[PDB]
Amino acid sequence: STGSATTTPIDSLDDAYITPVQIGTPAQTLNLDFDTGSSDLWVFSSETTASEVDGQTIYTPSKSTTAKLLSGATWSISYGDGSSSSGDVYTDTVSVGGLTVTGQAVESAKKVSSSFTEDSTIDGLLGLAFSTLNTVSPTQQKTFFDNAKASLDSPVFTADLGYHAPGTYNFGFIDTTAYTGSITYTAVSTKQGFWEWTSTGYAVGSGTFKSTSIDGIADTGTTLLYLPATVVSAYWAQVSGAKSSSSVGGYVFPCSATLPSFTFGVGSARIVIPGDYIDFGPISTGSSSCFGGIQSSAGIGINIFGDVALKAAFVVFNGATTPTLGFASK
């Protein structure tokens, strides 16, 4: 089997991407944030505290003939941005782009933190990291990809995120028309539950490439590119007037600037992020200070190849017995 679904930016900045997902019988379509940095499929629901729902579409298990309470199971998750959610668990039929999994754990939110409530465009998350990170207790549950894998033509999914435009998540096949050149594959460590890999270095603009190992995670659920402070300083030093602002929470730059590109290495190959992809617009409405799309990871504990990096590439998440990642230009 295979599946193919379009993913769409939630706003003009590509702050996140939503993909329609069919849950239950008859289908209830919710727009979920596919997140290769986590491993829970959770949704706004008829159980979510009413004051914490503000425009989201909800899953109502009582209206699904295939929903079953997973008795005794609870979940609770906290994300790197400080947001969180928790609740109970149903199993139900879940389909993405024509690919159907029966018996998928659908984690129903009873509580969500303010950032989720305040984002009316995201109805939940669909985790695509390794199932060892799934938070369901006392019986840990499998991701949608893990459940689908055996049925797929090939045990892979691909992320093809757009810049200010829709893109595609494919399951079970590699669309050879969706990228240019060849795909360069690189080793993955699953020791932390992430799609963790080692970039071979970077360049800023037209500058020379610096060969240096940068361990980090391919994370579709993080907006920006978070890299070591040395790398980030070398980038922003090429932008007149750019500075790190403690009050704003990162590097800012004059909105009048033209930003240089940023290149990262994948083995001997190179992925180029155009400068425009690094512009996240005014820090507040009407400001002439703009927020940068490359930020320091120094306070995180891990480097994160988020959407800013991934949307410059066609990315293969290879879930074979030994997982690997593939990157191609496009």
Side-chain angles (χ1 to χ4, degrees), residues 148 150-166:
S151 302
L152 293 178
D153 291 356
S154 183
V156 306
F157 69 90
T158 65
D160 180 8
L161 302 178
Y163 168 65
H164 295 352

PDB file of all heavy atoms in Angstrom, residues 148-166, unseen atoms left out:
ATOM      1  N   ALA A 148       1.631   1.190  10.038  1.00  0.00           N
ATOM      2  CA  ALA A 148       1.440   1.013   8.605  1.00  0.00           C
ATOM      3  C   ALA A 148       2.586   0.276   7.922  1.00  0.00           C
ATOM      4  O   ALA A 148       2.383  -0.288   6.843  1.00  0.00           O
ATOM      5  CB  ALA A 148       1.287   2.377   7.925  1.00  0.00           C
ATOM      6  N   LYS A 149       3.761   0.251   8.554  1.00  0.00           N
ATOM      7  CA  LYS A 149       5.006  -0.072   7.865  1.00  0.00           C
ATOM      8  C   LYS A 149       4.923  -1.396   7.119  1.00  0.00           C
ATOM      9  O   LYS A 149       5.314  -1.494   5.949  1.00  0.00           O
ATOM     10  CB  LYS A 149       6.131  -0.107   8.903  1.00  0.00           C
ATOM     11  CG  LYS A 149       7.532  -0.006   8.337  1.00  0.00           C
ATOM     12  CD  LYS A 149       8.515   0.407   9.430  1.00  0.00           C
ATOM     13  N   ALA A 150       4.419  -2.434   7.788  1.00  0.00           N
ATOM     14  CA  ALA A 150       4.441  -3.777   7.222  1.00  0.00           C
ATOM     15  C   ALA A 150       3.628  -3.858   5.942  1.00  0.00           C
ATOM     16  O   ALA A 150       3.921  -4.697   5.077  1.00  0.00           O
ATOM     17  CB  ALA A 150       3.902  -4.783   8.237  1.00  0.00           C
ATOM     18  N   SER A 151       2.598  -3.020   5.814  1.00  0.00           N
ATOM     19  CA  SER A 151       1.711  -3.026   4.661  1.00  0.00           C
ATOM     20  C   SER A 151       2.233  -2.176   3.519  1.00  0.00           C
ATOM     21  O   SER A 151       1.796  -2.353   2.380  1.00  0.00           O
ATOM     22  CB  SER A 151       0.330  -2.513   5.061  1.00  0.00           C
ATOM     23  OG  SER A 151      -0.204  -3.306   6.100  1.00  0.00           O
ATOM     24  N   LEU A 152       3.170  -1.283   3.794  1.00  0.00           N
ATOM     25  CA  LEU A 152       3.656  -0.355   2.786  1.00  0.00           C
ATOM     26  C   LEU A 152       4.492  -1.072   1.737  1.00  0.00           C
ATOM     27  O   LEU A 152       5.169  -2.061   2.018  1.00  0.00           O
ATOM     28  CB  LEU A 152       4.534   0.700   3.445  1.00  0.00           C
ATOM     29  CG  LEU A 152       3.814   1.652   4.391  1.00  0.00           C
ATOM     30  CD1 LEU A 152       4.815   2.617   5.012  1.00  0.00           C
ATOM     31  CD2 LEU A 152       2.716   2.414   3.667  1.00  0.00           C
ATOM     32  N   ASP A 153       4.461  -0.544   0.514  1.00  0.00           N
ATOM     33  CA  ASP A 153       5.271  -1.128  -0.551  1.00  0.00           C
ATOM     34  C   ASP A 153       6.749  -1.090  -0.186  1.00  0.00           C
ATOM     35  O   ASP A 153       7.503  -2.013  -0.517  1.00  0.00           O
ATOM     36  CB  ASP A 153       5.040  -0.379  -1.866  1.00  0.00           C
ATOM     37  CG  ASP A 153       3.658  -0.602  -2.444  1.00  0.00           C
ATOM     38  OD1 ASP A 153       2.869  -1.396  -1.875  1.00  0.00           O
ATOM     39  OD2 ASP A 153       3.358   0.041  -3.472  1.00  0.00           O
ATOM     40  N   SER A 154       7.178  -0.018   0.481  1.00  0.00           N
ATOM     41  CA  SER A 154       8.536   0.180   0.956  1.00  0.00           C
ATOM     42  C   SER A 154       8.409   0.856   2.317  1.00  0.00           C
ATOM     43  O   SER A 154       7.523   1.706   2.504  1.00  0.00           O
ATOM     44  CB  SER A 154       9.299   1.082  -0.030  1.00  0.00           C
ATOM     45  OG  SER A 154      10.656   1.269   0.344  1.00  0.00           O
ATOM     46  N   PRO A 155       9.263   0.507   3.290  1.00  0.00           N
ATOM     47  CA  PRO A 155       9.065   1.014   4.666  1.00  0.00           C
ATOM     48  C   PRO A 155       9.621   2.417   4.873  1.00  0.00           C
ATOM     49  O   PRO A 155      10.556   2.640   5.661  1.00  0.00           O
ATOM     50  CB  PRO A 155       9.805  -0.034   5.499  1.00  0.00           C
ATOM     51  CG  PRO A 155      10.955  -0.411   4.606  1.00  0.00           C
ATOM     52  CD  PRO A 155      10.344  -0.495   3.236  1.00  0.00           C
ATOM     53  N   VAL A 156       9.016   3.382   4.180  1.00  0.00           N
ATOM     54  CA  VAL A 156       9.531   4.744   4.112  1.00  0.00           C
ATOM     55  C   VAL A 156       8.368   5.727   4.139  1.00  0.00           C
ATOM     56  O   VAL A 156       7.235   5.408   3.777  1.00  0.00           O
ATOM     57  CB  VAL A 156      10.368   4.986   2.834  1.00  0.00           C
ATOM     58  CG1 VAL A 156      11.466   3.977   2.690  1.00  0.00           C
ATOM     59  CG2 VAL A 156       9.479   4.968   1.592  1.00  0.00           C
ATOM     60  N   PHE A 157       8.667   6.946   4.578  1.00  0.00           N
ATOM     61  CA  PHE A 157       7.819   8.087   4.273  1.00  0.00           C
ATOM     62  C   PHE A 157       8.723   9.238   3.861  1.00  0.00           C
ATOM     63  O   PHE A 157       9.919   9.244   4.152  1.00  0.00           O
ATOM     64  CB  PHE A 157       6.834   8.446   5.415  1.00  0.00           C
ATOM     65  CG  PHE A 157       7.488   9.017   6.654  1.00  0.00           C
ATOM     66  CD1 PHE A 157       7.674  10.390   6.795  1.00  0.00           C
ATOM     67  CD2 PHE A 157       7.878   8.188   7.696  1.00  0.00           C
ATOM     68  CE1 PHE A 157       8.265  10.905   7.942  1.00  0.00           C
ATOM     69  CE2 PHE A 157       8.466   8.708   8.841  1.00  0.00           C
ATOM     70  CZ  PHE A 157       8.663  10.065   8.962  1.00  0.00           C
ATOM     71  N   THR A 158       8.156  10.183   3.120  1.00  0.00           N
ATOM     72  CA  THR A 158       8.929  11.314   2.629  1.00  0.00           C
ATOM     73  C   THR A 158       8.219  12.610   2.981  1.00  0.00           C
ATOM     74  O   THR A 158       6.990  12.682   2.992  1.00  0.00           O
ATOM     75  CB  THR A 158       9.181  11.243   1.103  1.00  0.00           C
ATOM     76  OG1 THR A 158       7.955  11.344   0.383  1.00  0.00           O
ATOM     77  CG2 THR A 158       9.850   9.931   0.726  1.00  0.00           C
ATOM     78  N   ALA A 159       9.025  13.637   3.258  1.00  0.00           N
ATOM     79  CA  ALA A 159       8.555  14.983   3.555  1.00  0.00           C
ATOM     80  C   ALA A 159       9.053  15.918   2.469  1.00  0.00           C
ATOM     81  O   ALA A 159      10.264  16.018   2.236  1.00  0.00           O
ATOM     82  CB  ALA A 159       9.059  15.467   4.916  1.00  0.00           C
ATOM     83  N   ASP A 160       8.123  16.614   1.828  1.00  0.00           N
ATOM     84  CA  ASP A 160       8.432  17.552   0.752  1.00  0.00           C
ATOM     85  C   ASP A 160       7.685  18.836   1.099  1.00  0.00           C
ATOM     86  O   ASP A 160       6.608  19.111   0.566  1.00  0.00           O
ATOM     87  CB  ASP A 160       7.978  16.948  -0.581  1.00  0.00           C
ATOM     88  CG  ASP A 160       8.255  17.828  -1.774  1.00  0.00           C
ATOM     89  OD1 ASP A 160       8.943  18.869  -1.664  1.00  0.00           O
ATOM     90  OD2 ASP A 160       7.742  17.463  -2.859  1.00  0.00           O
ATOM     91  N   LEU A 161       8.245  19.610   2.021  1.00  0.00           N
ATOM     92  CA  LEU A 161       7.569  20.800   2.506  1.00  0.00           C
ATOM     93  C   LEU A 161       7.809  21.962   1.557  1.00  0.00           C
ATOM     94  O   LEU A 161       8.907  22.131   1.026  1.00  0.00           O
ATOM     95  CB  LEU A 161       8.095  21.171   3.885  1.00  0.00           C
ATOM     96  CG  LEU A 161       7.945  20.097   4.956  1.00  0.00           C
ATOM     97  CD1 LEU A 161       8.561  20.594   6.251  1.00  0.00           C
ATOM     98  CD2 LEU A 161       6.500  19.713   5.173  1.00  0.00           C
ATOM     99  N   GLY A 162       6.781  22.781   1.356  1.00  0.00           N
ATOM    100  CA  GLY A 162       6.892  23.940   0.492  1.00  0.00           C
ATOM    101  C   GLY A 162       7.336  25.201   1.211  1.00  0.00           C
ATOM    102  O   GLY A 162       7.123  25.367   2.393  1.00  0.00           O
ATOM    103  N   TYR A 163       7.965  26.099   0.460  1.00  0.00           N
ATOM    104  CA  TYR A 163       8.245  27.453   0.926  1.00  0.00           C
ATOM    105  C   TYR A 163       7.067  28.327   0.515  1.00  0.00           C
ATOM    106  O   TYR A 163       6.832  28.543  -0.679  1.00  0.00           O
ATOM    107  CB  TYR A 163       9.544  27.979   0.319  1.00  0.00           C
ATOM    108  CG  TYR A 163       9.745  29.465   0.518  1.00  0.00           C
ATOM    109  CD1 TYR A 163       9.926  30.013   1.784  1.00  0.00           C
ATOM    110  CD2 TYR A 163       9.758  30.323  -0.565  1.00  0.00           C
ATOM    111  CE1 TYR A 163      10.109  31.372   1.954  1.00  0.00           C
ATOM    112  CE2 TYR A 163       9.934  31.669  -0.399  1.00  0.00           C
ATOM    113  CZ  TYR A 163      10.113  32.187   0.867  1.00  0.00           C
ATOM    114  OH  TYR A 163      10.290  33.543   1.036  1.00  0.00           O
ATOM    115  N   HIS A 164       6.306  28.800   1.501  1.00  0.00           N
ATOM    116  CA  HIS A 164       5.147  29.649   1.239  1.00  0.00           C
ATOM    117  C   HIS A 164       4.201  28.980   0.240  1.00  0.00           C
ATOM    118  O   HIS A 164       3.590  29.634  -0.604  1.00  0.00           O
ATOM    119  CB  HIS A 164       5.554  31.037   0.727  1.00  0.00           C
ATOM    120  CG  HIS A 164       6.321  31.886   1.703  1.00  0.00           C
ATOM    121  ND1 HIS A 164       6.520  31.563   3.029  1.00  0.00           N
ATOM    122  CD2 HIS A 164       6.919  33.087   1.520  1.00  0.00           C
ATOM    123  CE1 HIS A 164       7.234  32.518   3.613  1.00  0.00           C
ATOM    124  NE2 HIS A 164       7.478  33.455   2.718  1.00  0.00           N
ATOM    125  N   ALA A 165       4.078  27.658   0.326  1.00  0.00           N
ATOM    126  CA  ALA A 165       3.306  26.903  -0.650  1.00  0.00           C
ATOM    127  C   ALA A 165       3.028  25.528  -0.073  1.00  0.00           C
ATOM    128  O   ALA A 165       3.760  25.068   0.813  1.00  0.00           O
ATOM    129  CB  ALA A 165       4.073  26.762  -1.969  1.00  0.00           C
ATOM    130  N   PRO A 166       2.003  24.834  -0.568  1.00  0.00           N
ATOM    131  CA  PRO A 166       1.775  23.452  -0.128  1.00  0.00           C
ATOM    132  C   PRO A 166       2.880  22.512  -0.597  1.00  0.00           C
ATOM    133  O   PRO A 166       3.647  22.791  -1.521  1.00  0.00           O
ATOM    134  CB  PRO A 166       0.423  23.096  -0.762  1.00  0.00           C
ATOM    135  CG  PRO A 166      -0.223  24.410  -1.055  1.00  0.00           C
ATOM    136  CD  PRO A 166       0.918  25.304  -1.444  1.00  0.00           C
TER     137      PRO A 166
END
